Enzyme design. Structure first.
Site, PDB file in Angstrom:
ATOM      1  CG  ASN A  21      82.208  -9.846 -18.300  1.00  0.00           C
ATOM      2  OD1 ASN A  21      82.445  -9.182 -19.305  1.00  0.00           O
ATOM      3  ND2 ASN A  21      80.994 -10.343 -18.035  1.00  0.00           N
ATOM      4  CD1 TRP A  57      84.661 -13.620 -15.864  1.00  0.00           C
ATOM      5  CD2 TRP A  57      85.800 -15.541 -15.745  1.00  0.00           C
ATOM      6  NE1 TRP A  57      83.745 -14.646 -15.828  1.00  0.00           N
ATOM      7  CE2 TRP A  57      84.416 -15.838 -15.755  1.00  0.00           C
ATOM      8  CE3 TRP A  57      86.721 -16.598 -15.677  1.00  0.00           C
ATOM      9  CZ2 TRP A  57      83.926 -17.152 -15.698  1.00  0.00           C
ATOM     10  CZ3 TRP A  57      86.236 -17.906 -15.619  1.00  0.00           C
ATOM     11  CH2 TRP A  57      84.843 -18.169 -15.630  1.00  0.00           C
ATOM     12  CD  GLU A  97      82.761  -9.386  -4.641  1.00  0.00           C
ATOM     13  OE1 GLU A  97      81.918  -9.749  -5.498  1.00  0.00           O
ATOM     14  OE2 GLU A  97      82.717  -9.746  -3.447  1.00  0.00           O
ATOM     15  CG  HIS A 110      81.571  -7.822  -8.907  1.00  0.00           C
ATOM     16  ND1 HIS A 110      82.195  -8.944  -8.408  1.00  0.00           N
ATOM     17  CD2 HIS A 110      81.940  -7.733 -10.206  1.00  0.00           C
ATOM     18  CE1 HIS A 110      82.911  -9.511  -9.364  1.00  0.00           C
ATOM     19  NE2 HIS A 110      82.770  -8.795 -10.465  1.00  0.00           N
TER      20      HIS A 110
HETATM   21 BR   LIG Z   1      80.868 -12.900 -15.679  1.00  0.00          BR
END
Ligand SMILES: [Br-]
Ligand SMILES: [Ca+2]
Ligand SMILES: [Ca+2]
Ligand SMILES: [Ca+2]
Length: 294
Positions: A36, A107, A130, A270
């Site tokens: 995401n 994800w 990450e 990230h």
């Molecule tokens: Br998220």
């Protein structure tokens, strides 16, 4: 560096849906999975390093990238279990074989680690960064974005995400150390140009994170693969980041405990693929070469 996408998008129908992906080359696949609120585009400057090393694949999660949106869409759509149902069928359709190397993030790591556990015999290697490695507590969450994430998981998440597109316009740029180009931001915001439900996937994801015990099904799944990963002899490349964001503190302590693992640290928060694409790419290509001698 580079705003241009890697390869060309191909499409395949899944559960009456039609999902998009990149499928370049031949041999055993090297599967790259975004999280995401990105898409396959996230791997555009890294996949090149793996050319000739196998079948390079990057799938767009359902509701993301060039993949179809689910409809009707709503607060209950796009939960983890629903993304896995589509990703599982997409990965089955692509005939991957039984020597798959997974390259995951965010994800994608949750989905990748899980698929890997369920299909361990078919997994040649795992390169992660990450990632959601285990269920966590708020204290383990990056403090600069802690209140924001607790807000996504509250009734205020609809305005923040569906109305203002905060995850794509604030979170993403905010967790990349270098300034993105106009074209690079376009490619990321394209799947979510429309306000409302088109952005639902980017709000449902943070609500799925296994934090403070909720949601319980996802927590259990993460407890599942974390346990497994900690004891699995499958070769692993842990691409650590500095300062990093998600995989730091307790989670990073935990990941450093995993077996048969090589580690390297690259600059980034990230979405490190935007800060050190070549350092990351080089490492993965080296990892795969050692896994596939010839
Ligand atoms: Br998220
Ligand atoms: Ca084979
Ligand atoms: Ca707070
Ligand atoms: Ca930034």
């Amino acid at each position: 560096l580079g705003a241009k996408p890697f390869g060309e998008k191909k499409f395949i129908e899944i559960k009456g849906r039609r999902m998009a992906y990149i499928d370049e080359g031949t041999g055993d696949p090297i599967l790259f999975q975004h999280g995401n609120p990105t898409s396959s585009y996230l791997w555009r400057n890294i996949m090149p390093h793996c050319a000739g090393l196998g079948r390079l694949i990057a799938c767009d999660l359902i509701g993301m990238g060039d993949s179809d949106k689910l409809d009707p869409s709503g607060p209950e759509r796009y939960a983890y279990a629903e993304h896995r149902d589509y990703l599982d069928a997409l990965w089955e359709a692509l005939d991957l074989g039984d020597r798959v190397v997974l390259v995951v993030h965010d994800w994608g790591s949750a989905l990748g680690f899980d698929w890997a556990r369920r299909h361990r015999e078919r997994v040649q290697g795992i390169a992660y960064m990450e990632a959601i490695a285990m269920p966590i507590e708020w204290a383990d969450f990056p403090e600069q974005d802690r209140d924001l994430f607790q807000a996504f998981r509250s009734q205020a998440g609809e305005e923040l995400v569906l109305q203002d597109n905060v995850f794509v316009e604030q979170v993403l740029p905010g967790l990349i150390l270098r300034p993105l180009s106009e074209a690079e931001m376009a490619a990321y915001r394209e799947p979510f140009l429309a306000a409302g439900e088109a952005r639902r996937p980017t709000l449902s994801w943070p609500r799925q994170i296994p934090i403070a015990g909720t949601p319980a099904d996802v927590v259990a799944i993460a407890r599942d693969y974390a346990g497994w990963l900690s004891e699995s002899p499958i070769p692993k490349l842990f691409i650590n980041a500095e300062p990093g964001a998600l995989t730091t503190g307790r989670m990073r302590d935990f990941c450093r405990t995993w077996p048969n693992q090589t580690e390297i640290t690259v600059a980034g928060a990230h979405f490190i693929q935007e800060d050190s694409p070549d350092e990351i790419g080089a490492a993965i290509a080296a990892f795969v070469r050692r896994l596939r001698p010839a």
